Design an enzyme around this catalytic site. Structure first.
Site, short mmCIF file in Angstrom:
data_model
loop_
_atom_site.label_atom_id
_atom_site.label_comp_id
_atom_site.label_asym_id
_atom_site.label_seq_id
_atom_site.Cartn_x
_atom_site.Cartn_y
_atom_site.Cartn_z
N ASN A 35 12.51 27.73 104.59
CA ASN A 35 13.83 27.08 104.72
C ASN A 35 14.67 28.29 105.16
O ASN A 35 14.33 29.76 104.90
CB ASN A 35 14.41 26.35 103.69
CG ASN A 35 15.34 25.24 104.44
OD1 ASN A 35 16.15 25.49 105.44
ND2 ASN A 35 15.55 24.10 103.83
N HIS A 93 12.08 50.33 91.64
CA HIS A 93 12.66 51.47 91.97
C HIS A 93 12.50 52.03 90.59
O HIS A 93 12.67 51.40 89.40
CB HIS A 93 13.87 51.56 92.18
CG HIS A 93 14.33 50.91 93.66
ND1 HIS A 93 14.57 52.02 94.40
CD2 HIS A 93 14.50 49.85 94.43
CE1 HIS A 93 14.64 51.25 95.55
NE2 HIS A 93 14.73 49.99 95.53
N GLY A 110 15.91 25.95 96.00
CA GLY A 110 16.76 27.19 96.67
C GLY A 110 17.08 28.29 95.64
O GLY A 110 17.30 27.98 94.64
N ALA A 157 15.51 25.35 91.29
CA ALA A 157 16.55 25.90 91.96
C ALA A 157 17.07 26.95 91.17
O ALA A 157 17.43 26.64 89.87
CB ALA A 157 17.57 25.20 92.69
N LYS A 206 11.30 29.92 82.99
CA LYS A 206 10.42 29.39 81.59
C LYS A 206 9.88 28.09 82.12
O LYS A 206 10.54 27.26 82.58
CB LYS A 206 11.35 29.56 80.25
CG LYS A 206 11.63 30.78 80.09
CD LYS A 206 12.63 30.73 78.69
CE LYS A 206 13.10 32.19 78.13
NZ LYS A 206 14.60 32.08 78.10
N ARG A 233 7.35 21.79 81.45
CA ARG A 233 5.93 21.26 81.22
C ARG A 233 4.82 21.42 82.26
O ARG A 233 5.20 22.13 83.32
CB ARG A 233 6.51 19.63 81.29
CG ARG A 233 7.07 19.22 82.59
CD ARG A 233 7.35 17.93 82.73
NE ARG A 233 8.99 17.60 82.95
CZ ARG A 233 9.21 16.89 83.75
NH1 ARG A 233 8.76 16.49 84.81
NH2 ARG A 233 10.80 16.69 84.13
#
Lengths: 188, 188, 188, 188, 188, 188, 188, 188, 188, 188
Positions: free
Chosen positions: B84, B114, B141, B159, B179, B182
């Protein structure tokens, strides 16, 4: 006072309806539009546009397109500033950036505060809170910096951070909200 | 070793000042620029540009403009990959994407590390950490994936997630930091 | 039922392969492309394009480029809606926006749900969950709003928030996940 | 088998009416058209187009415009290949070119065989015969190479030759039909 | 000596890697490109370009597009020279053309000799052999003229000829290799 | 008689200096120029241009660019005529092409005869000799057909042939000069 | 010292061959070129270009096209400066212009001195002599001002004057060489 | 004699109404127009145009745009000729310029004489008087040189001078009319 | 009275700030811009533009580009008026030009007078003094004509002249300031 | 007499074959073409074009595109003339239009008479009959006015009328042929 003067004095100002400010924002939008639609291999044209946007003669300020700013002239830049794709310097409040600064993609530096009360906000009032970016700093991608925030020299901001409060020098900081993890030893 | 060779070997390399790498990044920027300024109804031209960018013959790799990548040839794609708007595949470190992968808008896949020490960072050194994206995955997103991260096949990333560590297969994971919530049952 | 009808009825629909929907998405992509490549000083042309995109006669709907939407006609707008740079209104599910709404840069309003099971997801099925945005609201930059979410009138969403659940009226809310901080007194 | 598969297997295939093949030929025609209408001083754009045409990252493959090919991806190139003006690599049958190859102007490498019987030919059937071009070779201008022909490494083909049969390595060959004149001593 | 000087002295020269020669070839390629993309009805522009290419004020030198030359300034032309489509004057070695000369389509005048030994050839060495074209001559289409060849005044070269050796004046000559058929009576 | 009338009557005519003929040649050059600079994917525009060039409504006449002709209206075409790249139909003398004809790349069909005597030739006189191409024919690349030549139906001309004399029907013919090899059995 | 530093210190400097200076002159030439080819009704674009050229935010500095300058950033401008057509500010040596200054058409302000001795001049050395233009001044058309010249505030320079020496304040001066005629009473 | 011949012979000629001369002036105007509208950073294109204008291969002839000339081919140039902005070489009468010549902005070199009697002048008659510019010369801006004038080698002409009579070598000369001030010592 | 009326009545008028006058000057600037950027070979377009500029149907008024005027409609022209490059007709005060007038390059006809007192001048006041140019006149290049000046019919003005006072008919005049040299006999 | 003179004298004139008239018609066609292809929001450009077409400085003459006229200069207009879409002022015979005139869409004002006898008509002869349109008039759409017709001041012509004969002042008239219905009271 003019609305520009109130803006630059950290006072509430009519950001939305003042004509001089609308005109200055339009100037910067036009320059950004030009820059954003200039082929990356047109080195000279890009340099010219960047310089016109910031109203200064830049020294190794690399802008990866697209880029956005509200005024441009209210972004004070050092040398060797690397800005990756899709950054936005919302500069109603002065944005000061030091030397040797690495800015990741999708970063937003926001200096505008709106009133919480919708009645005042709907009238278009804003208050500008300057952002200070120390020299020798590195921002990961997806970082948002809020109004009035200072990020100390030699500091590193992790990707996705939402910087709501000041970050001391030589610090590694990450999170939403952005919190210091540890100090960085910046010596040989 | 050339700087390209060091990059592809997970070694510190002079990303900022090596001419071959600068040239390869410029090639990809130019292709992206072309693609990003090609009318979405110009199906053929878009297909050509995408193929040129990734240096492969794609099979149902749909890229919703704008798009960015650093090298393009260091993005290894499966079939049926849906990208997208406004994604960035920062591919100094190889980005491997499986088949049947849904990538939401504003996602960033970052392979560059870096140095924390500004002295080393200011010299332009970077270290590339590959990103592995399993087949049959879905990213919401505003997701950022950090260097060296592996996202297991059949997994779903919510998202706004900031993926700092590896995600096992068939897992639903969300957050900053990302994290596991399930496991997903991926059966009829 | 047509796939459009299933989409507008909150049912699972073949979003990816239905031709009418593909065509409607292409229409909107084309308009966005035009708009995104229109000089900001071309006031008239911009107004025309915005109106064409949303299929309505807008009243002070200001769109700062770039902008994206999936259908455009499924975005219902009030008057005085200010949309900053790089927003995406993913409108498979209707996106209703009230009057006097301030939308920050890099905001994403996502109405699409995919199946968690990759077998169903790979077939292209989606389910649209409408987003309701109350009048007199303000969104900071980098906000993501998930499917089916309602944000109450007079509310303020802090930058970087990931709005997974409904936000009551006259509330200040921030975070990932977005949580209410306090209520706002919206009186003189 | 698909018609592409039959083509790549040296079997009779419906070259003229198969849609995938028509599409692949159209892709290559478009790239050639772009390349042929790119100013010779646009070094970068030319490099990009050549790479897109051959679907590889070329190493000193110089193409003097105009150029034509049928598929592009079925031309396998070595490094240091110099192609002068108006060459045509008719690559239904793979065209393999070694390193350090000099190709004169107006050369045609033809891999297509049509049936002699007009009934079969009129139906659009063709059979592809690969062309192998050894490394360290030189072709004068106006040379035509027929299907299935191998030109040995270190060999020289005189201008105007029509190469109907295999040419051994380290040979000077000329004529219509092309015949070996003598062997070349390729030593210091 | 410069490589240009060696070229113009019939000595081996580094045609492929000398920068001044590369630049002069690029100049001519650019002019040809312009000419080849100029509408045939733009009489004035065409005249200008032709004159620029040959670095002379031509007198009825008609060039039917497309056209190619390597240097342009090393083509010495008489008046009333008619060049049909897709000719190439490979002019490392001077190409001298008399008055009242008819050149058919697809003709190539090649002055470059490469070493037969691939080691020397791969280094880019060439040796230029001038071509002399007498006044009052006519070349059919598809003719190739090799380095160092002289075609005598009043002579006719049949289509498809490969001119490997000198042709005496007032001669009709054809073939691959081109051989004299008879003499022509060029009197009233 | 006008010079056009003399041309169409196989008489000597002032090809070079007659204004109507110059104008008709210019018309055709312009159409060819347009066609040759039309993107191959612009199917409709190409069809229009081809039809305009030949002044007929073509039926599956496929022209692979570039293409050239002198008049265009003096090329009489059947259905299913496939013309590969860089062909030239020099049609002062009518060029008649049957149905189901395959024309290879770099083919030239030349109908112009010039006087051998330079005095007459320099005055611009020419004599046009029609070319007849039977139905169900196939020409390899690099073929030249001379004025007044007839190639019988069902015949095959090998690449590089220079057709100086008539070729009987159902014949395989090759060479410079083109000579019949054998007859073709054109039956099931 | 760099050549720029020598220039700005009124010392002899290598104006012609120093790369940084060549680059800065090229920057200004490009901006002038853009400006000179911008439609006079494109008010915004013109303002942007002027500001970019002088590297300042101008206040009612009106430039009637065409315009030329060597560096642009070495022209220090007041407010309300009206520059008529075809002026040239040759600014190697700083050109300081006050407020409320009227500059006629075809005026040249020349700060470059070349050595009189051709040997030194041919090496490209120059010496820059600043020009000071007082506030409240008026220059007729066709005026040339030489290096190091000061024109006092409130003064008027007649058309065609060649200003070789300093002009005191409130003076009317004309001629070649420019000489004071009388003093001006600049009071109500 | 043709009017061109009379022009080049210092005789009265019909400059205004002769078609060949009108055509040659139009050629030069077109080239100047192209050059004057070519971006200064398009080094190659500029070089090509300059060479086309003067019909020679220039050696470090730098032309600062805009530039004008009447014929172009009647300007004979040495190497290292620096022409600043808006010069005009009115070259009906040959303008010969030596090596190492510095020409300031707004200089005009006029070779045309008109009759004083309006009856003769109105008929368009002119007489061309050549201008000779010695090597190692320097012209300030705003200089006009009249027909038939010779400026000796090593001489310096002050800004604004109107050179009506010959200037001896190694001379400093200034004024309207231009008069020698002193001699220059051109030695180490 | 309107400011236009005061201008046309030789009265002090607000030239700088009156909107109708600003608009009329903008109209003329736009036409000049168009004309100045029209290829000299576009005869028809040029004629149209000239006629539009002067708001009359010209009869052999030849304008060599570039050209400038302030209003255009306040330039009254005779037939056969030849204007060479870079002239400026500053026509606040009517500029009347007779028939058969030759105007050299870089000529300026200035009708504007500013107040000497800076206070009045800074307010933008001007006074227009008409210029009358007799028929059968010739101006050399670099001539400036001041406000209110009349140049008598049949007169010749030498290059570089600064015409401050009226010149009688049939006179040769030159210099800065321009002074009569002798009378001209304008008879057969 | 010239054909223009005969046209303007109501005499038979060679409208079709006279070169000056053909040229004047071409001038007007070109201006109309420009105008008809100018964006309606380009107010300034439109004004310029209209003024150029009618060769006058219009006062509130509004032309809704498209528009056509034969000469343009033979249309005499008052102030406040409103011309709706697709009108044609065929002005061989002068078309005089008063002040405050409303012209509906698709109106044609035809001044050309052809001979009834085809022999004379085929030779191109025409006779122009002027049309007089009084001030304070209104024409509905689809009206045709024939040669020599006068429509009195204050009159109204109904849509679709074909005005073959003179209409008195202050009259309402409609029909084919157009006939007076009643008089209009044009008083307060």
């Amino acid at each position: 006072m003019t609305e520009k003067e109130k803006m630059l004095a950290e006072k509430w100002y009519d950001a939305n309806f003042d004509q001089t400010l609308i005109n200055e924002r339009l100037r910067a939008k036009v320059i950004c539009f030009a820059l954003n639609h200039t082929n990356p291999s047109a080195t000279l044209k890009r340099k010219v546009l960047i310089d016109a946007l910031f109203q200064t003669t830049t020294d190794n300020v690399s802008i990866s397109i697209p880029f956005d700013t509200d005024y441009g002239w209210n972004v004070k830049l050092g040398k060797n500033v690397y800005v990756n794709t899709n950054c936005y310097f919302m500069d109603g409040g002065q944005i000061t950036i030091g030397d040797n600064v690495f800015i990741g993609p999708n970063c937003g530096f926001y200096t505008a505060t709106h009133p919480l009360n919708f009645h005042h906000r709907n009238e278009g009032f804003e208050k500008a809170g300057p952002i200070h970016i120390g020299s020798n700093t590195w921002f990961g991608g997806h970082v948002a910096v809020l109004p009035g925030v200072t990020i100390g020299e030699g500091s590193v901001i992790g990707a996705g951070s939402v910087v709501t409060k000041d970050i001391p020098p030589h610090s590694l900081a990450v999170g939403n909200p952005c919190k210091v993890v540890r100090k960085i030893d910046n010596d040989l």
